[PDB]
Amino acid sequence: KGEELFTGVVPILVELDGDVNGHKFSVSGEGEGDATYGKLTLKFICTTGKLPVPWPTLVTTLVQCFSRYPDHMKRHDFFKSAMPEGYVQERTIFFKDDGNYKTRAEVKFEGDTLVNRIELKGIDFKEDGNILGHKLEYNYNDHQVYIMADKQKNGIKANFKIRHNIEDGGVQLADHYQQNTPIGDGPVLLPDNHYLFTESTLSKDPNEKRDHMVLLEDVTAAGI
Numbered sequence: 106k107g108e109e110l111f112t113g114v115v116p117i118l119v120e121l122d123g124d125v126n127g128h129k130f131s132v133s134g135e136g137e138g139d140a141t142y143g144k145l146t147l148k149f150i151c152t153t154g155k156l157p158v159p160w161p162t163l164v165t166t167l168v169q170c171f172s173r174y175p176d177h178m179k180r181h182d183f184f185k186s187a188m189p190e191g192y193v194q195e196r197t198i199f200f201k202d203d204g205n206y207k208t209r210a211e212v213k214f215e216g217d218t219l220v221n222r223i224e225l226k227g228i229d230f231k232e233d234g235n236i237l238g239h240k241l242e243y244n245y246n247d248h249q250v251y252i253m254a255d256k257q258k259n260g261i262k263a264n265f266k267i268r269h270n271i272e273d274g275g276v277q278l279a280d281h282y283q284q285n286t287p288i289g290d291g292p293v294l295l296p297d298n299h300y301l302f303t304e305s306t307l308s309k310d311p312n313e314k315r316d317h318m319v320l321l322e323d324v325t326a327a328g329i
Contacts, residue, residue, distance in 0.1 A: 110189060126229075191213025
């Protein structure tokens with residue numbers, strides 16, 4: 106089983122390359138996940154300098170294999186099942202009245218480390234909108250994710266809505282469309298419909314001079 110790869114703390118590495126309206130950027134994150142408690146702890150740095158989009162818009166793009174699946178649910182855990190070879194995660198994210206992100210990620214084990222490697226492409230944004238103009242509060246409004254099997258692709262799909270609080274009143278919507286595919290050729294646990302719940306808090310490291318985000322997360326799965 107790939108679920109036996111997660112019985113304890115797993116080091117995480119995240120690498121993102123982005124291009125939003127031609128503004129390029131990269132992000133490196135590092136931390137650890139523990140699926141037995143359903144918790145992640147990560148710190149991301151923008152390694153190109155100044156992040157040209159708000160950190161909260163990248164949270165969903167920046168490892169649902171760390172959700173805590175109850176024992177009576179273990180057999181619906183597609184994400185752990187695909188390990189160590191991993192899964193491709195693709196999303197389109199539509200920002201209401203603004204541009205869209207398209208993301209492609211490989212989430213897999215590189216030896217002992219769980220790696221999430223991402224390519225992000227954003228188009229049709231407004232240079233003075235809430236995203237390219239940095240008008241989003243540095244906080245987070247989580248939403249549950251309704252996971253559905255995607256039998257035609259031997260993986261899962263989902264769609265969900267993220268609400269981003271706008272500095273000075275107003276809420277900015279981000280409509281996520283997601284689908285995941287196994288990278289290897291083993292058998293993969295295809296689930297019944299269920300929910301993943303996440304609670305995120307964003308913070309800053311007072312001793313960090315680079316553009317960065319500290320992110321703590323509790324993640325569980327539940328049924329019906």
